[PDB]
């Protein structure tokens, strides 16, 4: 079992643009240096979530065929996926990108930001659940692209055009599972499991909602 030249090209495009993004040093310094208060910790999450939306727009633009979509649907896709993309990237950073001791300081700030435990508890549970799957970078990059290119978001004029962009990504992701996990025929079903979990975070987030960044206010419709 192997990826066709077409699936390889499409995968290489997703991977390249996914690796382009990174956490700013200017943010990393705040995690280390800024005061440990509910106001200061909430301000750090605001900075991190804003940077993520900017990184999410750069990734989204480079998605094969995204630019061929109607300009209005491009906005509805960005708005519909922002929250889910944030939680998936948050899971990635938690299980990967941060040093052992720095992650503890970040967790300390996420748990002391004045956000209720009825939301903080399923959040860390979700990161832990993602961590258990031991997802490769290709899986993180494909899941993020599938999340963004969801044909079932509200206010999309041409859903069929979006279906045509997402279906090839689900085909690549399923084929990668068959190639790398042939002994785990439930691996693809587990990844789809995280996609449904991610969708509950839209409900948790709206209930979760100090005024936020313009980039956040607009992409969340608050």
């Amino acid at each position: 079992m192997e990826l066709t030249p077409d699936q390889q090209t499409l995968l290489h495009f997703i991977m390249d643009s996914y690796n382009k993004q990174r956490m700013p040093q200017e943010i990393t310094n705040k995690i280390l240096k800024e005061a440990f208060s509910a106001e200061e910790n909430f301000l750090i999450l605001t900075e991190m979530a804003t940077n993520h939306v900017q990184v999410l727009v750069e990734f989204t633009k480079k998605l094969p065929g995204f630019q061929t979509l109607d300009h209005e649907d491009q906005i509805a896709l960005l708005k519909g996926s922002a929250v889910e993309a944030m939680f998936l990237r948050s899971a990635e950073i938690f299980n990967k990108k941060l040093p052992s001791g720095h992650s503890d300081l970040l967790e300390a700030r996420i748990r002391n930001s004045g956000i209720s435990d009825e939301y903080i508890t399923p959040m860390f549970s979700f990161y832990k659940s993602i961590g258990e799957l031991k997802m490769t970078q290709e899986e993180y990059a494909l899941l993020t692209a599938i999340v963004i290119l969801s044909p079932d978001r509200q206010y999309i004029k041409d859903r069929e055009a979006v279906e045509k962009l997402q279906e090839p990504l689900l085909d690549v992701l399923q084929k990668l599972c068959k190639i790398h996990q042939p002994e785990n025929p439930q691996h693809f079903a587990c990844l789809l499991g995280r996609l449904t979990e991610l969708r509950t975070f839209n409900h948790h987030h709206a209930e979760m909602l100090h005024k936020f960044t313009p980039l956040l206010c607009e992409i969340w419709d608050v």
């Binding site: 900017q54 906005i75 313009p214 980039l215 607009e218």
Partner: peptide, 11 residues
């Protein structure tokens, strides 16, 4: 509405 999102997507 969403002027900055529009700016980022088209820049």
């Amino acid at each position: 509405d969403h002027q900055l999102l529009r700016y980022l997507l088209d820049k």
